[PDB]
Design a protein around this ligand. Structure first.
Ligand SMILES: Nc1nc2c(ncn2[C@@H]2O[C@H](COP(=O)(O)OP(=O)(O)O)[C@@H](O)[C@H]2O)c(=O)[nH]1
Ligand code: ALF
Ligand SMILES: [Mg+2]
Lengths: 316, 122
């Protein structure tokens, strides 16, 4: 039989990354050429990431560790305009390196919640020497880490345990959600993605809205929507890794002002799970299959999906 | 088609948008991924880029592409939307055009190259 899988969630929640993991886990991975094609994206991601930090410093009133970085900071924008796909020159690499080691820049990086910084910034920036090589071919992790904004609706086909999986990947931004109705008919399961780490961040499309609340309001909308009654609502509480790192530094009370609990992984994660699971109104009738995932980790996604599939197999 | 002409589009995105038949093939693809408002907005931005007509065209474009819950609401961030909203001038949409351009180039355009609709033509 055929399965209509629908990947939903607010922007930057991890939908498209899960879609890549289906390719990795169920279709012999990415070829070398396929990886080479992401070289340009990895450079773009890296370059924009450092630029984001620099831009923020002025707004947030943060100064460079060494006054000599001002040169490099301006030199970043000069060479960002020239040094184009698909080569990072040694000069640019050195500029980005110096800026990234600088204490003022690091200060600003640490306050990234006050602006919009790619999740993968430090992943790439801390790995600059490797990626900056002219002979550099991105790894699968590099590919999985890349950020490319999904716009519209994209359909994928794969097979697993004798099931024809029709998978639908959509854009998560407010502007995109009108379009979601185009793939609501005949849905077997929805995998709703929540970026755990978004609890202290604000929406790129509205900087007065806390991301986690946007995700909550959205899930409430979907979860209780009467046309997904005969439809498996799987919840991926995603980015557990970034979350595990965040919760030691940034208090969850930014998101939930009433939360009297500790800032440790399992207690916080448990609290967030409740906030979503409590929004379910057909609690007597409808079951929510929640999982804590790391979309960029193949072993994790493979385990969780294997589980997800078994749910569907039993529930159909 | 050719495929001389056709083949050429995978080298760079400007080729595709520059050609008549190619631009039509891509709009067809975006329509199939329900992301066609991007190509439309860009196509609008070029006709945009008289001041009574510059004033005129701007409002029509805003209602169609930029207002909240607009029919063809494009996928840009809030920092870009506001500076767009605040700023009847020629270089007005430049930033928005560039963002949408990138949106198509980075996401849709690669998938267009791997579709059979282009793979056959080529
Ligand atoms: N560290 C980490 N990064 C993630 C995880 N899930 C997604 N990302 C990254 O977050 C960014 C946004 O992911 P994406 O799937 O494009 O978001 P989408 O808009 O919902 O499709 C990308 O750069 C991903 O590599 C995760 O579980 N852990
Ligand atoms: F929801 Al997205 F890229 F922001 F798929
Ligand atoms: Mg996506």
């Amino acid at each position: 039989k055929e399965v209509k899988l629908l990947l939903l969630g607010a922007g930057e929640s991890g939908k498209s990354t899960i879609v890549k993991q289906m390719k990795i886990i169920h279709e012999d991975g990415y070829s070398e050429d396929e990886c080479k094609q992401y070289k340009v994206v990895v450079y773009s991601n890296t370059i924009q990431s450092i630029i984001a930090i620099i831009r923020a410093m002025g707004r947030l009133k943060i100064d460079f560790g060494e006054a000599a970085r001002a040169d490099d900071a301006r030199q970043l924008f000069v060479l960002a305009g020239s040094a184009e796909e698909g080569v990072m020159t040694p000069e640019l690499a050195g500029v980005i390196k110096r800026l990234w080691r600088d204490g003022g820049v690091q200060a600003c990086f640490s306050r990234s919640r006050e602006y919009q910084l790619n999740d993968s910034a430090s992943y790439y920036l801390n790995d600059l020497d490797r990626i900056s090589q002219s002979n550099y071919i991105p790894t699968q992790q590099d590919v999985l880490r890349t950020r490319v904004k999904t716009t519209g609706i994209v359909e994928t086909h794969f097979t697993f345990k004798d099931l024809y999986f029709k998978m639908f990947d959509v854009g998560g931004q407010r502007s995109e959600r009108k379009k979601w109705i185009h793939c609501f008919e005949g849905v077997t399961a929805i995998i709703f993605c929540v970026a755990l780490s978004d609890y202290d961040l604000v929406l790129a499309e509205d900087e007065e809205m806390n991301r986690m609340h946007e995700s909550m309001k959205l899930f409430d909308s979907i979860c209780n929507n009467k046309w997904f009654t005969e439809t498996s609502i799987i919840l991926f509480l995603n980015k557990k890794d970034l979350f595990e790192e965040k919760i030691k530094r940034s208090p969850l009370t930014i998101c939930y002002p009433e939360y009297t609990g500790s800032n440790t992984y399992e207690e916080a994660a448990a609290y967030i799970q409740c906030q979503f699971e409590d929004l379910n109104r057909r609690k007597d009738t409808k079951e929510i299959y929640t999982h804590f995932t790391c979309a960029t980790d193949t072993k994790n996604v493979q385990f969780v999906f294997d589980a997800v599939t078994d749910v569907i197999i039993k529930n159909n | 088609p050719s495929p001389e002409e056709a083949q050429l589009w995978s080298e760079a995105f400007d080729e595709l948008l520059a050609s008549k038949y190619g631009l039509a093939a891509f709009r067809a693809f975006l329509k199939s991924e329900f992301s066609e408002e991007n190509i439309e907005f860009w196509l609008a931005c070029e006709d945009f880029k008289s001041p009574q007509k510059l004033s005129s065209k701007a409002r029509k474009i805003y209602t169609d592409f930029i207002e909240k819950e607009a029919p063809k609401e494009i996928n840009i961030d809030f920092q870009t939307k506001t500076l767009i909203a605040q700023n009847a001038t020629s270089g007005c949409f430049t930033t928005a055009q560039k963002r949408v351009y990138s949106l198509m180039e980075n996401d849709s355009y690669p998938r267009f190259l791997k579709s059979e609709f282009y793979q056959d033509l080529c």
